Write a protein that binds this ligand. Sequence first.
Ligand code: NTG
Length: 460
Amino acid sequence: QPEPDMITIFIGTWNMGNAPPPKKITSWFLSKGQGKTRDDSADYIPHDIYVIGTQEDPLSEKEWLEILKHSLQEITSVTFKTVAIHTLWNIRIVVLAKPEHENRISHICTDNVKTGIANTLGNKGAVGVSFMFNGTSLGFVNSHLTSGSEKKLRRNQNYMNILRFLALGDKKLSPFNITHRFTHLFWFGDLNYRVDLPTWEAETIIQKIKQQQYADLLSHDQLLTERREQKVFLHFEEEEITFAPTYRFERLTRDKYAYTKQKATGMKYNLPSWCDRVLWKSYPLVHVVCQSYGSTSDIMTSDHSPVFATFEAGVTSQFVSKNGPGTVDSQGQIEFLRCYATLKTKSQTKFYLEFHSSCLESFVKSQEGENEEGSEGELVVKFGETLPKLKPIISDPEYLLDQHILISIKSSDSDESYGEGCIALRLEATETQLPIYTPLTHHGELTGHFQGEIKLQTSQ
Ligand SMILES: N#Cc1ccc(N2CCCOCC2)cn1
């Protein structure tokens, strides 16, 4: 029975509004309703992995697991295995997988982050799950961010706290936050970004939604505009939105948006918004294709509609050779030529690099680079041909060309990372000097760039 080189992943996010679900929620897992929906001919085909994020979830873990498993069994006739479940307050993540994957999944991690301080600590934050699927690392974050149309900067701060403090994946990747630890990272939830139009325009917005004319609303969506100004979710992807705003509905219908201020809302307006979102980030040149992104029309217990997204995701096999794992394959090498980091820092410390990769026995520290002043007032750190030759554990090109090298540039004075990035080994050629590039980030914000050339030697 062969190992897969692709799997499909379902991501669901639903803010349940503290109400139990209706008796049937199969439309959610079938990707049926509005937006980019799944073909009817696929209805019996199970996804490999289902990841369900809830917010304002009033159920126990047992109660929700029973509903989810009974829903999937009715759709697929498969009894899914529980990989992980983790709950912070009323924010929950469930990961289910086909039973045939039980011995492909390992290194399961869960964590949460509580956002805010005093007044604003106690209900918002995030839960996460990570695991290995054969040779591929997968991370999943369900966040419930700060509410309210005039709190976009608080949401952005919540995002940065969650990616800094959520402790998932390989703890040996110490310089790297969750935005670099995984082959594929999915980040979803009630992100709570709103359509930023005047209150007076509420009925005009509703009109537009009834006409399925979303363009002048999406041009005011705070998550799209904050992402375009590089204020949040830098280097993440989102599918085009082609479904109506998923908040705020009158319960028990979808015919009415309830936007007006009420004592129950703190006298705040809730103009129709795309609160409920799925975003992803995958390593460079790894296959990831969104095959659905939409909302359900028939689940009406909450003031939010459920959102679905599904993905094709490339995966790799747990590679064994005669040599690695547990020795190097001296037929393999990675050389970095003429590399330099450009940093936005005002600091004048020396810097060194660390190279991290599951193709190495352990991470590799470089010598310090040579600092020069860039013309437009920046730091350029030159490494020359000084960088250590990296010795992968396996030289087979079928393995090595699928790997990635994480890079951290660290201060000699503090050993703190000033920037992190990732280089694919999926090269156009081996034994050939080729350009490489990554942006560098720290705490998820842009701090610089790393560029140079690579020369990869494989056994072929
Ligand atoms: N994705 C992923 C992944 C890979 C390894 C891992 N562990 C072993 C090394 C120490 O890190 C924490 C536990 C955890 N998660």
